[PDB]
């Protein structure tokens, strides 16, 4: 499967200027477009090399939709702050995530249209693409309004049409890189934490896509109860890094094995320490 996603952040700055409006577009784990309100000239910009092929008519239409959405969030921020009885001075954040997922056939798998206010769930379009789930009392008011107005039909028409159509097109433009997988380059490092125990760290480096499974499994433990797992992090070259660590008694390190699952690996990696 493949995914097209837009991450929209609107932050009001009372007394400092208009709300900052930022929209970032991702195809799978690769970012291809950006709109930032604080740029000297705010317009949609390519953040992937394969997007520099797009003609002005693409960029002008995208920028206009971004500028249109900016007014939407400027109103919606004001509408929210007044409903919640919040202080006018307070800065507040509206977040929106929308996009589509396509299956093996490259036909739509799921459509997303979700909102968060001040970092909490507000309203989200359900998987049916026809009904809404409200997080709080305020969202229940948004839901009744959007039900009568028929907003779900407006968003579903895009998710079912332009979103999937442009996902397949983006996959065509960046095909030689987007469809590639980079299997993780994995190794085990041995650091003797104490005089009684040692920390074993399993590394997975330079892998794309971002999804990965790292487990240390002792004697066949499916996973480990006391294991430090860091968040998957970007290397900055389009590949990602992750590591998993366990603290084990000295002399029993060879019982522990690290297992790596990735889209690049048809078979899982099994890693052991060897000094």
């Amino acid at each position: 499967p493949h995914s097209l996603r837009y991450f929209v952040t609107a932050v009001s700055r009372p007394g400092l200027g208009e709300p900052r409006f930022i929209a970032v577009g991702y195809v799978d784990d690769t970012q291809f477009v950006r709109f930032d309100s604080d740029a000297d000239n705010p317009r949609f910009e390519p953040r992937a090399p394969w997007m520099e092929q797009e003609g002005p008519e693409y960029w002008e239409e995208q920028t206009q939709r971004a500028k249109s959405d900016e007014q939407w969030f400027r109103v919606s921020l004001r509408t929210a702050q007044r409903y919640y009885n919040q202080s006018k001075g307070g800065s507040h954040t509206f977040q929106r995530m929308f996009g589509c997922d396509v299956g093996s056939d490259w036909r739509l798998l799921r459509g997303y249209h979700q909102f968060a206010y001040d970092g909490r769930d507000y309203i989200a379009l359900n998987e049916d693409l026809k009904t809404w789930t409200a997080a709080d009392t305020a969202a229940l008011i948004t839901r009744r309004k959007w039900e009568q107005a028929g907003d779900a039909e407006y968003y579903r028409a895009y998710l079912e049409g332009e979103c999937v159509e442009w996902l397949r097109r983006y996959l065509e433009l960046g095909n030689e890189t987007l469809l590639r997988t980079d299997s993780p380059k994995a190794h085990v490092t041995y650091h003797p934490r104490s005089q009684v125990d040692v920390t074993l760290r399993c590394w997975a480096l330079g892998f794309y896509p971002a999804d990965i499974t790292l487990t240390w499994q002792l004697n066949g433990e499916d996973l480990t109860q006391d294991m430090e797992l860091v968040e998957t992090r970007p290397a900055g070259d389009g590949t990602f890094q992750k590591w998993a660590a366990v603290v084990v008694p000295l002399g029993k390190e060879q019982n522990y094995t690290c297992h790596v699952h990735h889209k690049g690996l048809p078979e899982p990696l099994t890693l052991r320490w060897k000094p």
Partner: peptide
């Protein structure tokens, strides 16, 4: 991209 239609309230 798709812009919003109805406002939250």
């Amino acid at each position: 991209y798709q812009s919003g239609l109805s406002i939250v309230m």
